[PDB]
Amino acid sequence: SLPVLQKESVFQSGAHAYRIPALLYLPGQQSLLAFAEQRAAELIVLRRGDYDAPTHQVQWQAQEVVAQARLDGHRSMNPCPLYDAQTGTLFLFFIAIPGQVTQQQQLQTRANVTRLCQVTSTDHGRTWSSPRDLTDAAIGPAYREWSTFAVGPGHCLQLNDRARSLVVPAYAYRKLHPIQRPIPSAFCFLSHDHGRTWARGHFVAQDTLECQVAEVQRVVTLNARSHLRARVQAQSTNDGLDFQESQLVKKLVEPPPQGCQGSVISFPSPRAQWLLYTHPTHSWQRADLGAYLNPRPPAPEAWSEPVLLAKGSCAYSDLQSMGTGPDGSPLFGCLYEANDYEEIVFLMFTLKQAFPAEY
Ligand SMILES: [Cl-]
């Protein structure tokens, strides 16, 4: 989007202390929660921001550490927030890894010591519950078959099915062969009971990493980072438990050989749903963050050419729809890494600003 409503650095560090953004919109409060990892143990920080209607700007409040989102002796990473519309409760899923090499790792280099955790809030994110280790309940037997894993980063998904199911995007490094290095593959964790029980979905294609999911029958579309020149996408008709054959989305470039995390969300069509996605647009560098639109999701061929949101160094990003903007079109919030990881920038713009040809 050429013109934007707001562009503000919400996290800054010449030492690259802030990375891995996660954004969550609270529709009732009309506020945003911006999460990020803070490095030197590694912790998750947060800044609350209220959408001020009179000025149509988000007023960001002081930064605070999410003290509860951590396990003793562990580093916290990959903030993955979710708003449960049925209860109003907020979930912050995250990963916890020992701060130093453990005795177990000393004997078995690839031993899994990564933990899946969560903290919840019933007061719009002002205070959080003590951490809950979901590892055993969500992963189970497969745990020892991986070297490590992660969720998100970025916002999770809640479906519009009867149960208002929760879907948490993830990926795991599978220890498929003793000599070969572990291979990552994306998948989803699924809960039909607001996080009481969890099911682990089947993996999508091999060599897929950080991913996010959106809903558009109702299908869950998973958009993942790859080591190829294009994004990998797959759709599921059973809430993410099983995905149809993965596809390469040539219209969405991925800078080889490492690729970069990107974000995707669905939003009500301005005419079903459309998809909005953000990711760097350079063919081989993490640069020039762009916004892409898919008016006939999840068809890979329907993705639009990107509109430049920010020129220069840009990496990870996270999107959130924020209701209706001042001009009458869908409002969006985007948190992204910029300037060689020296900052995390917040951008707010509308669909009309980003894709004027639509109006
Ligand atoms: Cl709310």
XYZ file of C-alpha atoms and ligand atoms in Angstrom, residues 26-30 83 124, ligand 1:
8
model
C -9.074 -7.752 20.159
C -12.372 -6.859 18.380
C -14.356 -5.867 21.468
C -11.682 -3.675 23.029
C -10.556 -2.532 19.564
C -8.330 -14.642 20.588
C -7.865 -8.771 27.629
Cl -11.968 -8.110 22.813
